[PDB]
Amino acid sequence: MAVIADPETAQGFRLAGLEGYGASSAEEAQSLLETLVERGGYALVAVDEALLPDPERAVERLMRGRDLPVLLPIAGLKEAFQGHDVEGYMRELVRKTIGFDIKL
């Protein structure tokens, strides 16, 4: 498939049969992901959280009406050693979804 991430992980994705690349900036990522989703022969692309937290702000304009390429934030190279705050993410999600901060 496709992943916009650090080229050192990109080769590992190639080992998993997944073409990947990156250049470590939000603007260039958003630039070439336009082509990537126009040349979107796959159904999902991954992007680290540090490039830009929300790919919706980027591809929402070009993916209009189309649903196949699902886009999600994925752990980065800093998280390769530290980890992630999973529950904070889920909670700020349900906050905007069902209107309030819950399950506390």
């Binding site: 498939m1 080769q11 590992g12 080992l15 998993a16 999902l44 998280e79 390769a80 069902i98």
Partner: protein, 165 residues
């Protein structure tokens, strides 16, 4: 509206139906909230497993590029072809059809089944499981965001009725 006793009865019937529609929408939204919270737990669980699977693949790729040849890794990159058989099954979720991913993902019959690379040979195995965890996280979060959209839709409808109609 023409003022007649018959019209008064008809409008009163309309009011009764409006209220008995509001309460039904409310019950449906409650069911949706139950389903949504049932999903959020398994969603964060898949996120947990993905986090603990990313570290493994990351570490396997780490020493394989340094403590093995800094070039055998790129040779393995050029060696293996890409994967495209990611055809998705459209999936029903509460009156809507959403994509669900069934990437075929062949592993065994590809080129160079066994050979020379020392740490690369197994670091290529870790990114397989990394991709599986990715596809599970995607498959759960698409459904979660869909159910969320349905909930906000229904609450919009309830507010519309109870505040305008």
């Amino acid at each position: 509206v023409s003022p007649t006793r018959m019209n008064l009865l008809q409008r009163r019937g309309q009011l009764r139906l409006a209220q008995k529609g509001v309460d039904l929408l409310k019950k449906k939204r409650d069911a949706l909230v139950a389903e949504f919270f049932g999903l959020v737990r398994e969603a964060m669980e898949a996120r947990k497993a993905l986090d603990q699977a990313a570290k493994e693949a990351y570490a396997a790729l780490l020493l394989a590029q340094a403590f093995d040849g800094p070039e055998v890794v790129a040779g393995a990159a050029l060696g293996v072809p890409p994967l495209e058989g990611v055809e998705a099954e459209v999936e029903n979720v509460w009156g809507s059809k959403v994509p669900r991913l069934k990437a075929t993902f062949p592993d065994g019959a590809l080129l160079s089944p066994v050979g020379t690379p020392a740490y690369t040979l197994e670091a290529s195995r870790a990114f397989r499981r990394y991709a599986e965890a990715l596809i599970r996280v995607a498959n759960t979060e698409t459904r979660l965001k869909k159910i969320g959209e349905e909930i906000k839709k229904t609450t919009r409808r309830v507010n519309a009725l109870e505040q305008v109609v």
